[PDB]
Amino acid sequence: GRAMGPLPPGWERRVDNMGRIYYVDHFTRTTTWQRPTLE
Protein backbone atom coordinates (compact mmCIF):
# COMPACT_ATOMS: atom_id res chain seq x y z
CA GLY A 1 0.00 0.00 0.00
CA ARG A 2 1.95 2.97 -1.32
CA ALA A 3 0.04 4.39 -4.29
CA MET A 4 -0.75 1.67 -6.82
CA GLY A 5 -2.02 -1.90 -6.55
CA PRO A 6 -0.12 -4.56 -4.53
CA LEU A 7 2.31 -7.05 -6.07
CA PRO A 8 1.78 -10.85 -6.24
CA PRO A 9 4.52 -13.20 -4.93
CA GLY A 10 6.82 -12.30 -7.81
CA TRP A 11 7.33 -8.59 -8.41
CA GLU A 12 9.20 -7.52 -5.29
CA ARG A 13 10.50 -3.94 -5.36
CA ARG A 14 11.32 -2.25 -2.05
CA VAL A 15 14.08 -0.60 -0.02
CA ASP A 16 17.14 -2.58 1.08
CA ASN A 17 17.59 -2.04 4.82
CA MET A 18 17.80 1.74 4.41
CA GLY A 19 19.43 2.65 1.11
CA ARG A 20 18.13 2.44 -2.46
CA ILE A 21 15.08 0.69 -3.91
CA TYR A 22 15.37 -2.18 -6.39
CA TYR A 23 12.97 -4.52 -8.16
CA VAL A 24 13.91 -8.02 -7.02
CA ASP A 25 12.07 -11.12 -8.23
CA HIS A 26 10.88 -14.09 -6.18
CA PHE A 27 10.91 -16.87 -8.79
CA THR A 28 14.33 -15.97 -10.20
CA ARG A 29 15.77 -14.38 -7.04
CA THR A 30 17.71 -11.93 -9.23
CA THR A 31 17.04 -8.19 -9.10
CA THR A 32 16.52 -5.36 -11.51
CA TRP A 33 17.23 -1.74 -10.71
CA GLN A 34 20.82 -1.17 -11.80
CA ARG A 35 21.87 -0.08 -15.29
CA PRO A 36 24.96 -0.80 -17.46
CA THR A 37 27.90 1.59 -17.73
CA LEU A 38 30.95 -0.20 -19.14
CA GLU A 39 29.98 0.09 -22.81
CATH number at residue 37: 2.20.70
**21 lies in which domain range?**
1-39
Domain count, the chain: 1
Cα torsion 16, 22, 27, 29: sign: negative
Q: Alpha-carbon distance 22 to 15, whole Å?
A: 7
Method: NMR
Residues contacting 24, CB < 8 A, separation 6+? 12, 13, 14, 30, 31, 32, 33
Q: Alpha-carbon distance 27 to 29, whole Å?
A: 6
**Cβ pair 22, 16 in contact under 8 A:** yes
**Cβ pair 29, 18 in contact under 8 A:** no
Q: Alpha-carbon distance 13 to 33, whole Å?
A: 9
Burial 18-39 (b: 16+ CB within 10 A, else e): eeeeeebeeeeeeeeeeeeeee
Q: Alpha-carbon distance 8 to 19, whole Å?
A: 23
